[PDB]
Every structure is written in C-alpha cells, then in structure tokens.
C-alpha cells in the first residue's frame, strides 16, 4: 500500500517479454462485465494462455515492436479505449473471439448507459398490486389496471440501440425483472503476424 514501486519500467519489462512470447495479441474491454463474470472468463483464457497489465503502460507496444520488426506508429489509429487489457495467447484469432464474444455472462442494463441493442418490454401481468402505475406510463410503457393487477398493454420498444437509457427507465425495468445483454471481454482488436484486424 505504501510508496515503494508500484513499479515503473519493471512491470513494463515483464510486459515487454509477454507480447514477444506469444503470437496472438488482443486488445479487450472489461468495462461492462462483473468480476465473477470477468474472473471466470479469465479462468478459461488462463489454462490456454494469459492476460497482463497496463495504462498507457500498455501503450508501449511500440517498445515491443521496436525490439522486433513488426509495427510502430504504423498501426491505423491505436485502437485503445477506456477500460482496455491485453490477451497474449497461442490461440488463433477466430477461436478467441468465439470463446469470449459467444460466452458472456448474463447481467442487467444500467441507468445512463447507452443501450447496445434494442430494448423491448412485453405485454402481460406484472403481477403487482395497485400503486404507482404512473411511473411506467412516464417512460412510454402503456399500462393500465386489469383484474386489480398492473398489466403492460402491449409490446413496444422503450429504447433503441445507440440511445441512452434514462435513470427512471433502467430502475423500472429492473423491478419488472427484465434484463437481457451479454457481458464479457468486448474484443476491440487483434494482432497476428503483421496484420491488424478490427471488430
């Protein structure tokens, strides 16, 4: 916890040898995914070959590149985004994506997050007794009281992909028990053998 490194140039130095040891290098997104979910996802990778560290200490692929003859500089626009890791692997490119991208860990949306895909809510009885039905109506979910229970009138899209989910919107959906997205290591890039693959 104290001041002692918290290393600089030392952890970079371990990291240096790690791009060079493995053929295939991935630029990946934790941000969304819980850590029982990440930590489990990482368990899979770890048997096969392993993931290591950085900030901008990550962006220093250049030093690694400088040791060999491979990229600089030369890359398209260094794709790194908030919340990035590097996955160093034996595992060929195509398979790594199918493990990570296909098998994501369940999870519910969040308030103030941009929806990744279209959100819908179904029609049918919520099962909930009379109360503040109004809250549902505020979002643009039609509801009315039928049989002394709150029911949603119809299926409709509450939010589209690429629009943000409002704070009210999220909370009300969670009470419904409606979630739906796939969380995991969102692949943002690949290097293998002098070649750059985007998502």
């Amino acid at each position: 916890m104290g001041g002692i490194r918290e290393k600089k140039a030392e952890y970079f130095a371990k990291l240096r040898e790690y791009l060079e040891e493995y053929k295939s290098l991935f630029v990946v997104g934790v941000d969304n995914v819980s850590s029982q979910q990440m930590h489990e996802v990482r368990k899979e990778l770890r048997g096969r070959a392993v993931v290591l560290m950085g900030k901008n200490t990550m962006v220093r692929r250049a030093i690694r590149g400088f040791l060999s003859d491979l990229p600089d500089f030369e890359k398209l626009l260094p794709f790194v985004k908030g919340n990035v890791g590097f996955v160093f692997t034996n595992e060929p490119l195509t398979e790594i994506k199918n493990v990570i991208v296909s098998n994501r860990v369940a999870a519910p949306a969040r308030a103030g997050a941009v929806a990744p895909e279209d959100i819908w809510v179904r029609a049918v009885n919520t099962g909930m007794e009379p109360g503040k039905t109004s809250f549902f109506q505020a979002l643009g979910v039609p509801t009315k009281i039928a049989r002394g229970t709150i029911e949603i009138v119809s299926d409709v899209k509450v939010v589209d992909a690429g629009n943000k989910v409002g704070q009210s919107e999220a909370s009300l959906l969670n009470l419904l028990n409606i979630s739906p997205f796939t969380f995991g290591l969102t692949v943002v890039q690949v290097y293998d053998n002098g070649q750059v693959f985007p998502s």
Binding site: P130, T133, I145, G148
Partner: protein
C-alpha cells in the same frame, strides 16, 4: 329518549350532546360559515369565467327557459327550486350531455359531472372504479376523513 317538546328536542339535537344519557353522540358540532369567516380575495381569475347566453330546452311536454347569467372563477353557485323545474336539465346542458333547443354553450372547459339519481350501471367493483378515476385523491388525508374511515 323520553318524549320531549318540539322546540326543545330540536335544540338538544343540534348541541350534539344529551345530558341524562351523557353522551356526545356527534364528534363535532355543526357550524355554518358566517360569511365574515370566508377568505377575502379579489376574484376573477382569468377575468371571470365562462358565460352562457339565454338557453331553452323544450321536450315538447315541458319547456325550460334560462336567463343569461355569468359565472366567475373560484365561485360556487347553488341551484334551488322544485323538481320538474328543469334544474336537472340545466346542469346537463352545461355538461354537454344535452343539446339545447335554442341557445348554445360550447365551452373550452373540461367538466366533471355527478348525476342526481344514482343507479349502478357499471360493471366492476367499487375500488376498481374509483382508482380508474384517480388514485392519489385516495391517498389524501381529506379523503380519509370524509370517505374511507367513516363508512369503511
């Protein structure tokens, strides 16, 4: 109670208390506002409310005549008279339920109306019906005092 005089029995009734029995039969005494008691405001709101012209509604067996009057905002108007006078007819016209034979009253206003003789003709239970109209009015403390707690 034991038999009493006409004047006497009525007087005791209004007190809300009977001495021999020693019971306060009514929780609160009845009082009427003096008209001194009322709040003093300059009333108009938007300058006065809506106004209706002369109206007539004739069934062909009964004819109602109405003299042009004005209504103002935040006021209350009583209607009195004997039945069969078209007290009911008049209110309906203002409700827009009835169309006048002559005269017209097309107001912009939103109206709520309660009918005179109430016979049920709504399927559903009592709570469901009142909740559709408005919930939240049901939450208010005023409504607890007057409706919910007394009857149950």
């Amino acid at each position: 109670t034991l038999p009493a005089s006409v004047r006497e029995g009525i007087n005791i009734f209004l007190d809300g208390h009977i001495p021999a029995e020693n019971l306060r039969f009514r929780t609160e005494a009845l009082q009427f506002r003096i008209a001194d008691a009322t709040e003093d405001l300059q009333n108009d709101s938007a300058s006065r409310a809506f106004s209706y012209p002369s109206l007539k509604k004739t069934q062909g067996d009964f004819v109602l005549n109405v003299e042009e009057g004005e209504f103002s905002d935040s006021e209350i108007l009583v209607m009195m008279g004997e039945n069969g006078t078209g007290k009911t007819t008049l209110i309906k016209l203002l409700a827009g339920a009835l169309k006048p034979d002559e005269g017209q009253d097309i107001p912009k206003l939103n109206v709520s109306m309660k009918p005179q003789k109430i016979a049920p003709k709504f399927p559903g239970t009592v709570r469901q019906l009142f909740f559709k109209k408005i919930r939240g009015q049901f939450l208010n403390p005023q409504f607890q005092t007057d409706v919910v707690k007394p009857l149950r």
